[PDB]
Each structure stands twice: as C-alpha cells, then as structure tokens.
Amino acid sequence: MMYLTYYFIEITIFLAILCTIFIISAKNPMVSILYMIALFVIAAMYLYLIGLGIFSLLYIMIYIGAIAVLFLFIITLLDINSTELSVKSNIRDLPLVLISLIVLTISGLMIYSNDSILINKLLEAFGNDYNTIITQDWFNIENTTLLTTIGNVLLTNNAFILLVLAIVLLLGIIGPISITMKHKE
Amino acid sequence: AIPFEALLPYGIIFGLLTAGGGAMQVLHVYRNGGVRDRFAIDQWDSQMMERDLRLNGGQGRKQVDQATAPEAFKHNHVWKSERPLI
Amino acid sequence: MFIGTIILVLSFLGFVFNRRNIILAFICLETMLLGINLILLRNSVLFDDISGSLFAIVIIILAGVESAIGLSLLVSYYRLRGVINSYGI
Amino acid sequence: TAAGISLTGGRNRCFSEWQSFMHCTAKTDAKSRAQCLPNFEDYMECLHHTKEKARLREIESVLKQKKE
Amino acid sequence: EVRHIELPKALYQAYTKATQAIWWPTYSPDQVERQFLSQKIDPSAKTFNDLDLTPMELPDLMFKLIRPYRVNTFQHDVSQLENKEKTFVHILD
Amino acid sequence: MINANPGFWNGPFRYLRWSAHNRPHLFFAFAIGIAGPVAALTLTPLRRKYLYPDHSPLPQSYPLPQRAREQLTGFDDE
Amino acid sequence: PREAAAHWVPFEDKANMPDNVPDVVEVGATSAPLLSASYFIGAKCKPYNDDFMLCREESQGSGAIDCLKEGRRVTRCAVSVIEDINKSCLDEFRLHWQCLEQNNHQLSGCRKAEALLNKCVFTKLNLEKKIPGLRPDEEPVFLKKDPWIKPAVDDFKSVRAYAEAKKNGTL
Amino acid sequence: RPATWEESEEGALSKATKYFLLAEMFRGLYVVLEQFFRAPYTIYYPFEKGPVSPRFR
Amino acid sequence: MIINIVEILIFLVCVLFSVAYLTVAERKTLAYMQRRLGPNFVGYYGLLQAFADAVKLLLKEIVLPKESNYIILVISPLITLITALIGWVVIPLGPGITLGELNLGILFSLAIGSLGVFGSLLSGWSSNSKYSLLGSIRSTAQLISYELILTSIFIIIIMFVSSLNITTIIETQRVVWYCIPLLPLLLIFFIASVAETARPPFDLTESESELVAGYFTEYSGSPFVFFFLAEYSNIILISAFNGYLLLGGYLSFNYSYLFNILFNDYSYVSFLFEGLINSSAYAIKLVFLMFSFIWVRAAFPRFTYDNLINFCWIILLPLLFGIFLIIPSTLYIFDSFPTLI
Amino acid sequence: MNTFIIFIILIPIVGFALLAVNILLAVYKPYNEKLGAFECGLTSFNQTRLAFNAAFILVAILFLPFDLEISTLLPYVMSIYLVSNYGFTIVLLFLLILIIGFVYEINTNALKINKHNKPNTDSLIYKL
Amino acid sequence: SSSLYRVLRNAWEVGPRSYWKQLNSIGDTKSGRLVGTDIYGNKFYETDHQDEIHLRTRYVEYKEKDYD
Ligand SMILES: CCCCCCCCCCCCO[C@H]1O[C@H](CO)[C@@H](O[C@H]2O[C@@H](CO)[C@H](O)[C@H](O)[C@@H]2O)[C@H](O)[C@H]1O
C-alpha cells in the first residue's frame, strides 16, 4: 500500500508530455486550448505533490479561470483558420526537431550543475537517487504559511515591485482601450 | 404561516440537511473517540499530535498526563525520508 | 526540474515549428511561462526560500497582462483584416 | 531584499553557511577573498548536496558489489 | 472515412451470438452466415420490366440518402478572400 | 441638454450638488474611498490620546535575552 | 523545516544513545496537559530555558551536541513541575485539559477550570500565571470578567466545580 | 417645462438612499409576499367543475 | 475508511435530494405567490414531481443535431455538475464537521467557482451556429463580470479574519455576524449571486434565446437533468457562501445555559443535539436565501445586457474599490488588524 | 484515503451514471429533420463570424487585470497583522494607482454600446 | 384557505378512511354533507365552511379508480 503513490510525479511528467503533444496535434485550436487547460491541471497537481497547493489553487483561479476563458472568448468571436497537421507540410521538421530536442534538453539539464567536465554535468542532473530527511523543529511559533510570507515580503521588503505591478496593470487597462476602442473626439 | 403545502419541501430540505449535520457530528466524534474535531490546525499541532501518537500506543487523540514517559518513547522517534522532487 | 524543462522545450518547439495557427503561438508562450514557474517553485521548496515564490506570483501577474495585451493586438489585426490566416502572423 | 527568508517567514535552510561566508567577505578584500573558499564550498554543499551524494554512492557501492 | 475491420468468422459469429442476449436488435449470427451467400437470381422468375418499371440504382440516390450525415467541414480555398474581406467592417465602434 | 455637467472649476459646491443628484454611484463611492485615508490621518492620534493607545507587540519568536550566560545549578545529574 | 511532500516513509532507529551522554527521563505528557502546564513550566524554568537557548546560539551550529546538559536540566525542571501537579493538583489539571480536548485547544473555552487550577498551584506550589510584555494599563485576557469570545458549550464538570468552589469560598 | 436637478423638493441624500436601498423594489417584493398569505384561486378540476350557465354551448 | 464512505453517502444523499425538492419548492412558492398552487398531484402533496421529471428525462432520446458535436454537448453538463458538487466538500455544517477541512477552503470555493464559466462557453461550440456563439459570449461576459464582485466581498470579509478556513470564518462570528457591520455587502453579494447563477432578473440569454431558434441550452435527456442539478445546486452553494461569509453559517444563540441544564457530561445525545442545532441554523438560513431567489424571480422584470454590464462595472465595483479603502482604514484607526486564526 | 480525496475522485468517475442509464434505457432512432435545428433558417457559404461590438471583447480583456488586482490583494489580507501600518499604506497606494485606471475606463466609456442609426435632431429649415 | 388547521379539522370531521381516499383521489381534504348519489355510483357533496372559496363548495367522489 505504501508505494502505490510513489510514481505520481513521473505520471504527471508523462501526462504533461502527452498534453503538449496533443496541443501541437489538435485539429481545432479550441481543442488545443482545452489541452492547455489539462496541462494546467497537471501542473497544479504536481504543485500539490511537492507541497504548494496554494499555488495550485492560484493557478486554477487565474490561468484556467481568466486566461483560458479569454482564449475561448476570442476563438469564439474571431475567424482563425487552421492548416491540419500534415506529413506533406511538417515532416521536413523532423531532423531539426530531433536535433533541437536532444540539444535543448541536454543543455537544460547540464545548466544547473557547477561541475567543470561537461559529461558529468548531465550525470549529476540524473543523480536523483537518495531521499531527503525531514526532521522536525519547534522554533516556528506562529501559523505563517506561504501566502502570509508572500504578503509580508511583497508589502514590506518588496513594496516597490508591487507598486510597479500597479502600473503594469494600468497598462493592462489603458493599452487595450487604446488599441480596441475608437475615440470619437 | 398559511401555505403549508409550499413549506413542506422547505421542511424536507431543512430536515435532510439538519439530520445530515447531526449524523456527521456523531460520526466525527466516533472517529475521534468522544472528542469534538480539531480544525485550523497548523504545523505545531500536527507535530504535537504525532508526539501524542508516540506517547500513547497509537491510540489517536488519547491524552496522557503522566510526568515521565515510557522507555519506548526514546526509541519510537520518527524521521521522514522523502522522495527526490523532480 | 524535469517537468518544467520538458514543457518549456516542447512548447518552444511547438512555437517554432507551427505552420498552423496563431493560437498555438499564444498557447506555447503561456506553457513556457508555466514550465519556468514550475522549475522555480521546485527550487523554492528545496531551498526553503520565498524569493522563488515571489518571482512566480509576479510571473503569474505579468503573464496575465501579457495575454490581455496580446489578445488586444490580435483584435486590432482582425479589425483591419477580418480573418486570421494560417500564415502571415 | 527577500534574501534569507523562509516559506514560513524565517531563516532559510542554508542561512548559517551564507552568513558565515558573508562575515568572511566583510573581513576580507578582493586579494584576501580566497580565504572564503571553504565557506562558499559549505554554502554550496548545503544547497545542492553533491559531496554527500558522492559519499552515499560510495557507501551504497560497498553495499552493492563487495557483497554480491 | 467509413471504418471497417474484417475479422474472422468464428469470432464475429460468437460475438453476435453473445449480443442476442441484450433486448435491442443487433447483427445476428445468421447475417454473418449470409455474408458468404451472394445473390443467385432465378431466371425463370419475372422482373421489374414485366411491370413497365425502370429502377433507379444506388450511385444516383446515394447523395440524396447520405447527405444528412455529410459534415461539410469548411469552405474551399479561403485564399482569394483576404482583399475582399478587407473592405467590410468586423468590429463596430 | 437637461442636467448637463456644470464643471468642477466653474464652482465646486454646485458641481458636487449636481453629482449627488445626478451621479450618486460615483459621488458616494468617492466619499467612501476618500473618508478612509483622511480619517486614518486625522482621527488616529485622537484615538491614541483620548480612547486607548496602541497595543504592545506580540512576541513573534523566542525572546532570546541579550546577555551573557550565567552559571546555574539545580536539576543536574545524579 | 518544511513538511514532507509527495511520498515519505517513516523510519525509526533502534540504536541507543552514546555512553558519554548521561540518561534523562522524558516528559511524557501529551498536547493538552502540557498546554495547561505551559505557564507553570515557564514560571519555574525561565533560567534553564534561556540558558539552553543561549548555549545553542553561542554554539553557532553545534547546538544539538553542545547543549545536552542544558536540555537535560530543562527536561528535569518540566518533569518536576508536572510531578508536582500530579502529586497535588490532579483533579483541576484533568478538568482543564479534558476541557481543552473537547474544544480545539482554545484556552478561551476553559476559564472556569483555569481559575481553579491557577488558584491551586499559586497556593500550593507558589507559581502564578502572568502574560509578559503587557503594560499596567492592559487587562490580561484570562482575567477578563465578561469576554466577547465564549465557548459554544461551557464544560459541565468545570461549571459544577466552579459553582461548588464559589459556594465554599475556595475562589 | 421639464424640471432640472435644481428646483427639486427632495434632497440628494434622500433620493440617494432610495437609489441605493431599492425602496420601490422592496415594496414590490412585499406586495408579492402579501399574496403568499392569501387564498389560492385554484379549483381541482376532475373533482370540482367551473361555472356553467343555461346558455352554454 | 468505512465511516468515511458512510459520511460521504449521507452528505451526497441529503444534498441531491435537497436540490430535487428545491425544484418543487420553487414551483410551489412561485405558485402561491401567483395565487395558485402547483405541483400537488404527482405525489402526495407534490413530493414526487422532481422524480417524475427525472424518470421521464432519463427515458427520452439523446438526439444530437446534424451540425453539432457529440462529445462537448454530452460532457459540458457533466463537467458543470462535477464542479458544482465538488464545491460542497468545504462547506461546514458544524465546528469542523466537513468533508474537506482545508485551511485554504475559501480559495478552493473561489477557484472551483471559476470553472463554472466553461459550461456556458462550451455550450455555444456545440453547433455550427454563429449567433449561439455570441449568446455564449454574452453569458460568459456576465459571469466573469460578477465573479469580481463576489471575490471582492470575499476579500473584504477576510480583512476581518485573516484565514481561509471556513470554520474559522464562522467561529469569528460568534461575536457578531458580518451582515451587521457590512449590511450593504449582503445586498451586493445576493445580487451578484443571482447574477452568477444566471437567474432572473439576470436571465438574459435564456430569455433571449428561447425567442430565436438557438443561443440557449437545447439539450434533451440526461444532459438536461445534469444541467438542472447543476443550476439548483449552485443556487444552494452560493447561498452557502452568503451563509458562511455574512450570516454566521451554523451559528445561533448561545446554548451553553440550556445544555448545562439538560446535561451533566458529554454524551452522544449531547453531540447529536449540538449538531442538529448547528445544522438547523445553517439550513434555515439556506431556506431563507432560496426563498429570496424565488421571491426575486416572482417580483421583478428582466435586465438587458447593456444595463447589466453597466450596473456591474459602473455602479458596484466603484463602491467596492472604495470599501477596500474604508475597511482597512477603520481597522487602522482602532488598532484592530486581525491576527492569524 | 481521506473523505476529501474520496469525494473529489468519486464525483467524476461516477458522474456518468445517469448518462449511461439514459443511453441504455432511452430510444434512439434519428430522422434527418430530428437531426435538424430550427423552425426556419439558413445561411450560404458567406462567412464563419459575425461583426461584434468592441465592448463584448473589452469586458473580457479587462476582466484579467481587475481579477489580478483583486487576487493580488489576497497576500495583504493574509499578512494584514504582520504588515502593520506600513503595508496598509502600501496597499492603499496600490489601490489608488489602480483606481486611476478605473477612472480612465469610466471616463472613456469603454463598456458602452454605441448606436449607429441615430434619431435625427436637426431642425427643419426652408430656403425661401 | 390553504392552511393546516383546515386539513386537520376536516380530517377530524371525515375520518382517516376518507382522508386517505381523498388524498389518493383529489389531493385535498374536504368535509361536506352528502347531497346525493348518481346512477353510476358517484357521491356528491356540498360544503358550508367559510374557508372554501367560490367554486370549491361542491365536489365529487367518484366510484371508479379510473375516474372521468
Ligand atoms: C433537479 C432534480 C432532477 C430532476 C430535474 C427536475 C426538472 C424540473 C425543473 C422544474 C423547475 C422549475 O422550472 C420551471 O418553473 C416554472 C414551472 O411553472 C416554469 O414556468 C412556466 O410556467 C408559468 C407558470 O404558469 C410561468 O409563468 C412561466 O411563464 C412558464 O410558462 C419555468 O419556465 C420553468 O423553469
């Protein structure tokens, strides 16, 4: 019973690969948006798995709740023609696709380690074998969670980035009105 | 109130949700052993509950008021070995 | 680390080798940001650090504003043209 | 600005090694900065656990081939 | 693309024999028996032409009969639509 | 037209009367939003002086003393 | 530290402490009686507790191995407090922590047992509850006569005992 | 002539209270609720018939 | 995990049958308001009308038209119903008496309510009809526009209690229900609730579309049953949100005196009576709010899309962006910023 | 196996119960015109989209920033005590800066629907 | 009158047999005096109570379960 839930990170990785392939592959882009929603669900799962369910719910309410909604909103209102995934059109990409897959994945796994010899830089990235010990301390007296600390640092130690995000959101209001609306005089 | 025939469905809704809450209170208490539920529990209370499970014989929320622990409490300590996150 | 790099790389390839849509380009950008945020949050958990989660929530906000602006620009393009075709952005 | 803060609002996992290294940097100049090499090695070891992983690889290999 | 399978007799016949246990009509085992029996027309028997009737045949009526199940996915070659579409109003101010 | 805007700079008080009569959804939102910061600036010190002062801080962690160690005994071994 | 994530197997250790480390009894009380005896532990173990924390801080990393004598003293002082409670003040203590259990370990639902226990320990053991950090102008919340926040159901045994103690002048 | 916002026999705050608190709407709610406590007009047809006259066709 | 299954089944049964009888309650209350009576003939006193409707619908064809899509039409009801029902996991009927006692319960509610918009979005895509794709758009605009007001009221309440645990939000209201200091927010939250449920006076696209050949939900059979369950469950859940945010949830008068009179020690009768009282309070509040939904359907006419969007974005959100400033200022003036738990 | 987990999995993998009951119990023998869609109605191969007013898409595009604003206020209400009288001022400045954009939105009348066929308001003047 | 005292009082007037018959037939509880019977076997009643509205004073109790 113990290890029935061991491979639930690997399953999410597998499902993410699948949903990305379906995004690239779907005929109608509405289906691509739905598979993007499924990928957000998978990411939210993984975030619960590693202990960040607050971010899972934030993702569900922001990404799926607003951004995906707006995507569906625009494809319901705009004519977006599509060419179907074809072998007479896309098979030319296979050599470069495979070369780039190998190169980009291997470099993305090599970039995280500080070892000098290049082959060892990948071999340390795949060195996920030994478990972490979780010991318990008694020093945290309060009920501070991740959201509380985000608020604390964002409103005290990092107040400037919040008061700059305010202007970013002002752009988010003022740009679309300038671009979409036509002012009479 | 006059129209009882209109209040009968409201009475059924009321009775069903009331009985559900009551049965759920009873089942929660049976699960806990004669004690109301805990709620709004933080890290501290979780660690203290695990400590209680170490001091009683795994008997849930049973409390102990003695001043010296059994000599099993010295060797009953748990560390958790976590999967590598990837 | 793995899920994020994989999502990022596959989204980048599905952006680069897209001969189909513009919606796929939008989707691949959003999934790229998702992958970065997941690597970021895994490192946040392992180091027990808040700067990663702060950067992540900031990315959420900025990506929302990016989506809003991008889909306003698409709407201007469609104001003038009336059809968003397979090619031509 | 938010450096050294945990998910719970306090000191992070590898605070002490970082603080030792920064004490030694404050003591030193750019020419005496190489004295702070062991402290930086300790900080990075706390972060990434490379040396402990290699150690456990050795232990496991002795449990692996010298028995079977 | 209509899907067809072409799996053997001893298996399909048993599957049909099993699906007669549900209450609604299904493909019967004797129908897959008749799948091997082509039409043998009796020449001594009368025909349509004795009744001064000339039948239709299937390819001329298949359109009429199957067009309800025709999807009609999209229009043909929307290239050459761009510059004419450019003259219409698509978002009303 | 019937009750058009008279302009804030051609009279503030008349403009605000017009706003209360013809744009209450904006006027009273303005009032609600403005009355918080201004009250926070002006009434808080009066509250500290005449009603009750601010509370003393909560601990937030173990209050580690700022002293050197003292030699103790009691509850030693044996 | 963080809580475990995504999979975790508990593992114990059947080894004994080294012999250069003397033995020390453990405290053995669960959550609720310890929450009830927290303030009486703090009234008596202030020097030992702060010496334990000061030797941890001065050690700068080696507190687990440098602070063992000091932690043994802390444990012994706490055990002495709880032994004194059990020897002398057990009925009121049990009222208090059973009352804590039926609530959510909220001390606001247990004031009628808390009063009896505080009186008993102040008279017999000479340990009083004090919430530090306050001013002389601030009222401690455990001495408020009519609070805003009250329990849903006040504990039955505690109510009967409070009534009897007011009829017998023990309070 | 039409009446402007001046020449108003009703203060701004009073009509703003009627605006924000939905006076007439609560009055309509109450007039609907008063019918909730009045006798239903419904006759159970197969067992009680409606009014017929000698002239009926 | 036996008693877990028992608790889940009890909760499911009570919730679903409450929905099925809310349909009858709607009909009978609207009737007696309209000086009529009905339904009273399909059970004794009308108590099997909803089950008759269900059994009829579950024997009807599941006709899907020529230029429609099978999968979307069939699963959109089911996704809507799943999202409507999993929001009941966090609803407490007592101090901790919940299926999901999450410390992030408000965010779970507020995030699972974010997914109810996809039903109205995907309904429009189940046909090759260009005007239903615009009715979809209008409905989704309404829903996303009133989501902001519900979330704003959520945050204004959480300014008073710095927790996302619904039981803690309720237990803070032993002192005062938050409908007393924030009585206008009760009106606003009820209005936005009626608008999120797409209920009259906010029934624009259902009303709009029954006129036209399309732009409404032309489902038959089981999809239709699922949509009715979703609607009449979201009504109870948004009234539940009203409850535990503003009306104290399960709280009532203090019954310590009565319990010390009736009892001498904690028994299971004691616990059962506590639970019955608490869930009785929660249920009578829910009944009042459902009656209010029905009353508002009986009383008022309908809005248009322009009047509705204007209502929202030019009347309600200004007040709330002002209240965001006035509530923390009121807490700063009196040194009453709330602690965690 | 917690009751939360049991419920949230059980609802999806059981929700198709009445779906299957309806698929197995109910008739299904379609017609052409039962697969049809309306009383009257038709459309040639003219287009795939209708012209829409700007407000229809602007409400959705503006839902994103205001929703992000109200969701960014969540850290504050969960940190309100710890950020005592400093974060209060900071979030007030935040809200004021974001109210300026709302003021812009109102004054531009961006969510208003405009009407083409105006009613004529010009006088009738006769050249003598 | 649509009140509960009406049905309780009438079901005290007409016994439980008549109550269950009326609940299975009419759906409502009515108490009146027997006026007569027709050739088919249907019994006809009239009420004098102020509670019953205009056009609800006369009613039928059919003999057949498949009434018409
Ligand atoms: C959810 C349980 C699972 C089984 C599903 C049950 C399905 C039954 C749903 C019925 C709910 C009530 O919904 C229904 O209410 C009344 C019933 O008079 C209808 O109303 C109809 O009746 C008249 C009343 O004479 C109204 O004036 C209105 O003009 C309309 O013609 C509503 O148009 C419909 O929405």
The answer, for E21 touching chain J at a CB cutoff of 8 Å, is no
Rounded Cα distance between D38 and D47, Å, is 14
The pair phi, psi for residue F26, each rounded to 5°, is -95, -40
Closest alpha carbon to I231 in I124, I130, I120: I120
| J21 belongs to a structural domain | yes
Which H/E stretch holds residue K35?
strand K33-37
Q: How far is CA B33 from CA B27, B53, B60, B61, I4, in A?
A: 10, 14, 8, 8, 15
The residue in chain G having the minimum alpha-carbon distance to the alpha carbon of residue I270 is: G153
Q: Helix, strand or coil for residue E27?
A: coil
Closest alpha carbon to I265 in G162, G102, G117, B31: G102
Distance of CA F37 to the CA centre of its chain: 6
Residues of G whose CB is below 8 A from I175: 148-149
The answer, for F65 touching chain G at a CB cutoff of 8 Å, is yes
The answer for C 28-47 residues in CB contact with B (under 8 A) is 42, 45-46
Show Cβ contacts of residue G76 under 8 Å, excluding neighbours closer than 6 positions.
F75, G24, G25
Instruction: Please state, as a whole number, how many other Cβ atoms lie within 10 Å of the Cβ of residue I190.
Output: 18
Q: Tell me the helix, strand and coil percentages in chain D, rounded to 5.
A: 65, 0, 35
Runs of H (alpha helix) within chain B: 4-32, 43-55
For the four alpha carbons of F31, F37, F39 and F42, in that order, the dihedral sign comes to negative
Token reading at C76: 């201007």
Helices H23-36/H12-21 angle, 10° precision: 40
Rounded Cα distance between F36 and I323, Å, is 9
DSSP 8-class letter at I162: B
Residue D1 is part of which domain span?
Answer: 1-68
Ligand 1 atom at minimum distance from I231 CA: 1
Q: b/e per residue, B37-74, with b = 16+ CB within 10 A?
A: bbbbbbbeeebbbebbbbbeeeeebebbbbbebeeebe
Token reading at A26: 């779907």
How far off is chain J from A134, nearest CA to CA, in Å?
22
Rounded Cα distance between C68 and E48, Å, is 71
* Domain count along chain A: 1
Show Cβ contacts of residue B77 under 8 Å, excluding neighbours closer than 6 positions.
B54, G12, G13
- Kindly list the domain boundaries of chain C, sorted by start residue: 1-89
Token reading at I159: 């300014």
Closest alpha carbon to C59 in D6, A168, A146, A19: A168
Strand partners, A132: B82
Q: In which residue are the tokens 């028995």 written?
A: D67
Closest alpha carbon to E78 in J45, I199, J116, I224: J45
- Chain length of chain A: 185
- The answer to whether D21 and D43 have CB atoms below 8 angstroms apart is yes
Which H/E stretch holds residue G41?
helix G38-59
The answer, for J116 touching chain E at a CB cutoff of 8 Å, is yes
Closest alpha carbon to C76 in G151, D33, E91, E18: E91
Listing DSSP states for H8-55 in one string gives -SS-HHHHHHHHHHTHHHHHHHHHHHHHHTS------GGGS-----TT
How far off is chain D from C46, nearest CA to CA, in Å?
8
Which H/E stretch holds residue G156?
helix G156-167
The answer, for H29 touching chain I at a CB cutoff of 8 Å, is yes
- Chain length of chain J: 128
The answer, for F63 touching chain A at a CB cutoff of 8 Å, is no
| J121 belongs to a structural domain | no
Rounded Cα distance between J24 and I5, Å, is 28
Rounded Cα distance between E28 and E32, Å, is 7
Under an 8 A CB cutoff, do C31 and A109 touch?
Answer: no
Q: How far is the CA of H18 from the centre of ligand 1 (A)?
A: 33
Phi-psi region of B33 (alpha: psi -120 to 50; beta: other; left: phi over 0): left
The pair phi, psi for residue K12, each rounded to 5°, is -75, -35
Under an 8 A CB cutoff, do K27 and I32 touch?
Answer: no
Rounded Cα distance between C61 and A63, Å, is 10
Rounded Cα distance between A19 and A30, Å, is 14
* Overall resolution, Å: 2.7
For the four alpha carbons of A71, A73, A79 and A84, in that order, the dihedral sign comes to positive
Rounded Cα distance between K51 and D25, Å, is 97
The answer, for I124 touching chain J at a CB cutoff of 8 Å, is no
Ligand 1: residue whose CA is nearest its atom 10:
I23
Q: b/e per residue, K40-61, with b = 16+ CB within 10 A?
A: eeeeebebeeeebeeebeebbb
Token reading at G97: 């922590």
Test the B interface: residue of G13, G23, G26, G85 with most B CBs within 10 Å: G26
Strand order in the sheet with K43-46: K33-37, K43-46, K58-61
- The answer to whether G40 and G85 have CB atoms below 8 angstroms apart is yes
Q: How far is the CA of I27 from the centre of ligand 1 (A)?
A: 7
Q: Letter for the amino acid at A64?
A: I
Q: In which residue are the tokens 């008693």 written?
A: I3
Q: Helix, strand or coil for residue G9?
A: strand
Q: CA dihedral defined by J69, J70, J75, J81, rounded to 10 degrees? A: 120
Closest alpha carbon to H22 in H32, H10, H30: H30
For the four alpha carbons of I280, I285, I286 and I292, in that order, the dihedral sign comes to positive
* Domain count along chain J: 1
Rounded Cα distance between I303 and I296, Å, is 13
Q: What is the CATH number of the domain that holds J38?
A: 1.20.58.1610
Ligand 1: residue whose CA is nearest its atom 14:
I27
The answer for K 7-66 residues in CB contact with I (under 8 A) is 23, 27-28
